Amino acid sequence: MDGRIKEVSVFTYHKKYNPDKHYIYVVRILREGQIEPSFVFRTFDEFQELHNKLSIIFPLWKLPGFPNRMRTHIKDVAAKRKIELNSYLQSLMNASTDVAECDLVCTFFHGSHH
């Protein structure tokens, strides 16, 4: 119930069996202009990079806490991040309008893969 983005969530995730590879999070976005949601695909490192960019331009008191990380607790980490990244996105969009609507946040939400 903000700008053009009205709802965001981490819809699901997939990938990586064994170690080497990585997980991708599906982010579901509902905008005031459309009836159906859009979906983009973002890694944990993309979310952490978005927070790191925001920290360049904003003091941390303006931003949500980021669920920082990346032989671990298996891939219960993927399931854990689905929840934490969703809480991050909700806090971000419920931030002051200067943060929730800034070009860095708008850019993160544009482009399936980019």
CATH number of domain containing 81: 3.30.1520.10
Rounded Cα gap, residues 102 and 110, in angstroms = 13
Residue found by looking up tokens 């980019």 in the block = 114
54 in Cβ contact with 104 (< 8 Å): yes
Say which experimental method was used. X-ray
* Total count of domains within the chain: 1
Rounded Cα gap, residues 88 and 46, in angstroms = 13
| Closest by Cα among 25, 28, 46 to 37 | 28
Q: Can you read off the two tokens belonging to residue 25?
A: 């999070």
Question: What resolution does the deposited structure have, in angstroms?
Answer: 2.1
Residue 5: C-alpha distances to residues 35, 68, 73, 81, 105 (Å) = 12, 25, 34, 22, 10
- Is residue 50 classed as helix, strand or coil in its secondary structure? helix
Residue range(s) defining the domain that contains residue 26: 1-114
Q: 40: Cβ–Cβ under 8 A, 6 or more apart, which residues?
A: 26, 27, 29, 109, 110, 111, 112, 113
Q: Where are the alpha helices (DSSP H) in 1-114?
A: 44-57, 76-93, 97-100, 103-108
